[PDB]
Structure 1
Amino acid sequence: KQLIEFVRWSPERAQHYRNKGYWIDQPLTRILTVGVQSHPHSLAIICGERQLSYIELDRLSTNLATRLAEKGLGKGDTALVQLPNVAEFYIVFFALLKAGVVVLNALYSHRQYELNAFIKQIQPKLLIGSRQHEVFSNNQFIDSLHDVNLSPEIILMLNHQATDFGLLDWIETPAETFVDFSSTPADEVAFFQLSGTGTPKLIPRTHNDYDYSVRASAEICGLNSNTRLLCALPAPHNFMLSSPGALGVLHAGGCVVMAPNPEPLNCFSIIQRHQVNMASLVPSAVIMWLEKAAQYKDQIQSLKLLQVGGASFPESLARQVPEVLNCKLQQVFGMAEGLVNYTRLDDSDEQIFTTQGRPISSDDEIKIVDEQYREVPEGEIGMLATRGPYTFCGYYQSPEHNSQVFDEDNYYYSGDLVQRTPDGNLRVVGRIK
């Protein structure tokens, strides 16, 4: 009966964030609802040969939601979802948001070891996966869950076997009866994000905070109804999902275009076929694209904006993006825990090629501290500490850790080493363990 527990912002910060218009107290489903009202038939997702309009995405996720509610899944319940980069990922996500089921999206590259840890932490009553995944190749994993009383009441499978509950069956046809359902409240948990090294920690994200990061990111990256965003990174990743990600593109009324991964030749033909004009990558993938871009120039001419985040992205490599990939560059330094930094579209070249940008919000607060947690002199290198309208206040059910990474003012210490540049942007120089 209880809603999932999580650490709240102080009432004072929550009020401030409402006052500024960051938190508008709407569910994440807002994105679909509004899209359906404005442009029901414009494309929301392109996946292989499939094309899903906004109203289709809306109907299909409502269908699955009704089926889950009919089975008694809802508020206070959790779910574990593990799907590849396919349209069903978003249908399921919006379905669970609609039903008020708090979902953890595992990476498709996660294995039974991680899945096991996730299941023990959130005890899902719903598990959705794919038979084509190693862990669900057989029933060894599922069975082993019964041997510990951690079996989900419901298990849906993509690429299902005849004796499976077929994910597409539950999506394609509504329930026989009508049970009532609705999203969890806007300042309560919507879903779990995952930290990015020894088994991902769970980051509760509320509707308010996530929708805000999405809406504000979309504005920063100039998304609009003509945006076609390649989704070649894992769909569940905070970067690919919200920065600005698929949610940001849907917020702006554009279209997400799926790819299994960042493999250059496949991505290039997808980009060409659908005239993709935006993409998001990590440096190792940018390098793969650079190796082939000269020869396949014609195929990627439609790219207008490439976001790059993660790892290390030296200036000399960054300059190759507009030079070889023939599109604008935007650097992104963010974290599933909250804070995201973007270079702005009207930043100087120097800023874009040598910094990782600046926070989404004027109310993203940042401390850069020395070994004694004193703020360093302006411009020096220090440890990042941060808080804001979309940065979390603690990991799920982890009081000991939380106390280790938050200070008395609820600043989060990400471990990143950073310096502020004179222009105002941030440069990430390393990481502290």
Structure 2
Amino acid sequence: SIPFTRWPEEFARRYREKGYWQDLPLTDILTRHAASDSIAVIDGERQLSYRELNQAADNLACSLRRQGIKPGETALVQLGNVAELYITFFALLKLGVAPVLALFSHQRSELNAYASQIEPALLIADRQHALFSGDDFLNTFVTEHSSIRVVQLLNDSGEHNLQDAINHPAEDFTATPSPADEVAYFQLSGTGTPKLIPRTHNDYYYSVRRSVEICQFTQQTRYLCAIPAAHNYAMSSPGSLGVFLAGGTVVLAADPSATLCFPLIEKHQVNVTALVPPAVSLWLQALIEGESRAQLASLKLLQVGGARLSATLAARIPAEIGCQLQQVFGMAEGLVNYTRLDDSAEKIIHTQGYPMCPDDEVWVADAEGNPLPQGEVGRLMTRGPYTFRGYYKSPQHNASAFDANGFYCSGDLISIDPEGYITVQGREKDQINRGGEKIAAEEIENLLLRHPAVIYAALVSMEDELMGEKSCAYLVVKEPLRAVQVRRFLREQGIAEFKLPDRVECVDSLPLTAVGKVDKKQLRQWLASRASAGRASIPASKAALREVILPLLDESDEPFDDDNLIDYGLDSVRMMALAARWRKVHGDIDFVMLAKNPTIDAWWKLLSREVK
């Protein structure tokens, strides 16, 4: 068996006796439809029956078994939004092989990290991925991961051609899924080392079943998959696995641009899709800028999740797109909260839903680690029938990631409604949520420190209108580095392109801890007092004052030194702010003083005085 942290016996029995764990493999999602001719997968021009989908999975599993792949073993897969992802996935389940489905965005350091951990016998990737265009990386990778005995490549026309395996008809094949209470596959986690989440058939099949129920997926569902298909969101909430379980149709898209997706939604009459907020921002702008909503008329449900949706953006969706919103707050660790189809337009705009299972136990903790009453803000704790009880082979990290009662901390600050619902309030874990992709501050900092000129490094999130958050790397350096240089360096480290720092700030020093690392939990306050210290400098010339004043007033006109600044749109609150700062030098300056004579002349007269 593959090592994972089991639920304690009383919980396993409880979950089994309640019917959350049904003891069926995940392969059951497909094989129940193994004779259906209705369409399961649409990928560009290609369409697969359910019966085609199952046959192909059977075929691939058989081909892999003929090449010496065995049950209990492990696989590394890098396939993006293509039909083969699902064929591969069920093929491995049928074979009883446990896959890690890497992001198509993942590069050499991610692929090495996953491979090192699972010791994979099987590697399936895609010659359309830049690492796999030629054969040089593949040669090194297999050499450096000697467990790898078989390699199958999409878009290849040689001995490793994945299409061959998939097209070769099974011959006396019996599926051998791993037991339902054992690992089915490894999910990815959002620390400086990639952490894997073992999922069992029981916990994961439950998370999908219950999602199908809540979202009412049916044979009639036509679901657009345009975010990354391998992510838990797109795979299971209810995602494409939900669609398959319901006997519906999955429509695949390379990316969630409006350009690509709008005509697909019309062509195939998508009624449900899952987006991340930047993509939502994108679709709204496209319509306002001319795109026809009529293309999206068939659309019945837009899922938004992965990141914090503003009430304002949340609210434009029925109004502008023309369909229901569902907020979905979820995590690969387990817990998924949905709003409901029968929720009020009120509940749907402001809250992130409540847990999909009634045995999902969630409780807001404080820093001491105490339950707070309903309505108070703090740490999210949780265990349940589909929340794991331990990262793959990480006992030290698990000792720190769970409480005494086996509750897992999600690193999310939340408040619970009177009525059960959850509204996300903040985060305490150290990560950037860049448009839905998670970045470990720890990981990026170690790579930055690898550069000769970098001595100290800190990665923090900054707000961005489209992306939600972005990365900011502060650096203390031996020699000045351009941001383009830092991004170039990290590219060379073979890391995913979204992990490239969005801004770089070189600085002369940074708050340090004891071990010689950067003190982040003051870098909060340290940063604030640097920005507010340049803004505390009282101008030393009339010119320097003009420089502070102009950006506060109207862009259109530029005033004369003796002009009434209010006639150029200087508002009284900004005036009050200036007063509060200048009073720190001349302590007789207040709002009333400035407002009596609101000109640069008169303010320079005051400002240029000697401190008395």
TM-score, normalised with respect to structure 2? 0.68
The question of 1:340 aligning with 2:336 is answered yes
Moved more, 191-200 or 113-122: 191-200
Corresponding position: 1:106 with 2:102? yes
1:407 equivalent to 2:434? Answer: no
Identity of aligned residues (%): 54
2:146 pairs, out of 135, 139, 150, with 150
Residue 57 (structure 2) aligns with: 61
Matched residues in 2 for 1:150 and 1:359: separation?
Answer: 43
Cα gap change, 1:179/1:271 in structure 2, threshold over 3 Å: closer, same or farther?
closer
1:246 to 240, 245, 248: 240
Quick one: which of 340, 352, 355 aligns to 1:356? 352
Call closer, same or farther: CA 1:167–1:146 in 2, change over 3 Å: closer
Residue 596 of structure 2 aligns with which residue? none
Work out whether residues 156 and 166 of structure 1, in 8 Å CA contact, stay in contact via their aligned partners in 2.
Answer: yes
- 2:385 equivalent in structure 1: 389
What letter matches 1:202 in structure 2?
A: L
Q: Offset at 1:23?
A: 0.5
Cα distance, 1:349 vs structure 2 = 1.4
Q: Distance in 2 between the 1:315 and 1:181 partners?
A: 47
The amino acid of 1:207's aligned partner reads H
Q: 1:248: how far off?
A: 0.5
The reply on whether 1:425 has 2:425 as its aligned counterpart is no
Task: Give the aligned partner of residue 294 of structure 2.
Answer: 298
- In the alignment, structure 1 residue 125 sits paired with structure 2 residue 102: no
Q: Which residue of structure 2 lines up, in the alignment, with residue 81 of structure 1?
A: 77
Aligned to 1:323: 319
- 1:28 corresponding residue in structure 2: 26
1:199: Cα distance to partner? 4.8
Name the SS of the counterpart of 1:384 in structure 2: strand
Structure 2 counterpart of 1:283: 277
Letter of the 1:268 partner, please give it: F
CA 217–104 in structure 1, closer or farther in 2 if over 3 Å, else same: same
Per-residue deviation, residues 112-153 of structure 1 (Å, max 9, x unmatched): 110001111011110000111011122222222344353510
Q: What does residue 139 of structure 1 align with?
A: 135
Change (3 A) 1:141 1:289: same
SS at match of 2:32: helix
Deviates more, 1:177-186 or 1:122-131: 177-186
> Would you say the 8 A contact 1:217–1:243 is kept in 2?
yes
Residue 171 of structure 1 aligns with which residue? 166
Q: Indicate how the Cα distance of structure 1 residues 237 and 199 shifts in structure 2: closer, same or farther if over 3 A, else same.
A: farther
Letter in 1 for 2:15: Y
8 A Cα contact 1:203 1:336, kept in partner: yes
Q: Per the alignment, in what secondary structure is the counterpart of residue 33 of structure 2?
A: helix
Q: TM-score, normalised by structure 1?
A: 0.96
Which whole-Å CA distance do the structure 1 matches of 2:147 and 2:258 have between them?
A: 40
Checking the alignment, whether the CA contact within 8 Å between 2:115 and 2:145 is kept in structure 1 is no
2:187 aligned with 1:193, yes or no?
yes
Task: Choose which of 33, 37, 50 in structure 2 pairs with 1:41.
Answer: 37
After TM superposition, what 4+ stretches of structure 1 lie above 4 angstroms from structure 2? 177-181
Assess if the C-alpha contact under 8 Å between 1:70 and 1:178 holds in 2.
no
Larger radius of gyration: 2
* Residue of structure 2 equivalent to 1:231: 225
> Partner residue of 1:375?
371
Letter in 2 for 1:280: A
Query: What is the identity, as a one-letter code, of the residue corresponding to 2:277?
Result: P
- SS state of the match for residue 362, structure 2? strand
Q: CA deviation at 1:262?
A: 0.3
Q: Deviations over 1:226-249 (max 9, x none)?
A: 100000011110000000100001
User: Which structure exhibits the higher relative contact order, with contacts defined as CA atoms closer than 8 Å and separated by 6 or more residues?
Assistant: 1
Task: Give the CA deviation at 1:179.
Answer: 6.2
Calculate the aligned-residue CA RMSD, in Å: 1.3
- SS of the residue aligned with 1:203? strand
Equivalent residue runs for 1:192-231 within 5 Å: 192-196=186-190, 198-231=192-225
Question: Could you tell which deviates more after superposition, 197-206 or 181-190?
Answer: 197-206
Q: Deviations over 1:147-173 (max 9, x none)?
A: 4353510000001143x4101110001
Q: How many residues align?
A: 427
Q: 1 CA distance for matches of 2:320 and 2:198?
A: 39
For residues 327-371 of structure 1, what are the alpha-carbon distances to aligned partners after superposition, in whole Å with 9 as ceiling and x for unaligned? 000000000110000001111111100000000100001121000
Distance in 1 of aligned mates of 2:321 and 2:82? 26
In the alignment, the residues of structure 1 paired with residue 173 and residue 51 of structure 2 have an alpha-carbon distance, to the nearest angstrom, of 22
1:7 maps to which residue? 5
Amino acid at match of 2:362: I
3-state SS in 1 of match to 2:363: strand
Q: Distance in 2 between matches of 1:200 and 1:422?
A: 37
Q: Distance in 1 between matches of 2:132 and 2:192?
A: 23
* TM-aligned CA deviation for residue 181 of structure 1: 4.5
* Counterparts of 2:232 and 2:192, CA distance in 1: 18
Contact 1:188 1:206 in 2 (8 A): yes
Q: 2: CA distance between counterparts of 1:142 and 1:18?
A: 44
Q: Distance in 2 between matches of 1:224 and 1:43?
A: 13
How far apart are 1:224 and its partner, in Å? Answer: 1.1
**Contact kept? 1:69, 1:181, Cα under 8 Å:** no
**Equivalent residues of 1:74, 1:181 under 8 A apart:** no
Aligned in 2, Cα 1:283/1:199: closer, same or farther, shift over 3 Å?
farther
3-state DSSP class of the match of 1:289? helix
Q: Residue 182 of structure 1 corresponds to which residue in structure 2? A: 176
Q: How far apart are residue 180 of structure 1 and its match?
A: 5.1
Aligned with 1:269 (options 263, 269, 275): 263
Superposed displacement of residue 174, structure 1: 2.8
Name the CA distance, whole Å, in 1 between partners of 2:192 and 2:341: 36
Q: Please say if residues 329 and 336 of structure 2, whose CA atoms lie closer than 8 Å, have aligned partners that are also in contact.
A: yes
Structure 2 residue aligned with 1:51: 47
Contact 1:32 1:58 in 2 (8 A): yes
The answer (yes or no) to whether the contact 1:269–1:299 under 8 Å persists in 2 is: yes
Contact 1:145 1:151 in 2 (8 A): no
Q: What CA distance in whole angstroms lies between the structure 1 residues aligned with 2:191 and 2:81?
A: 23
Q: Is the 8 A contact 1:69 1:180 kept in 2?
A: no
Pick aligned residue for 1:97 from 68, 84, 93 = 93
Distance 1:198 1:288 in 2: 31
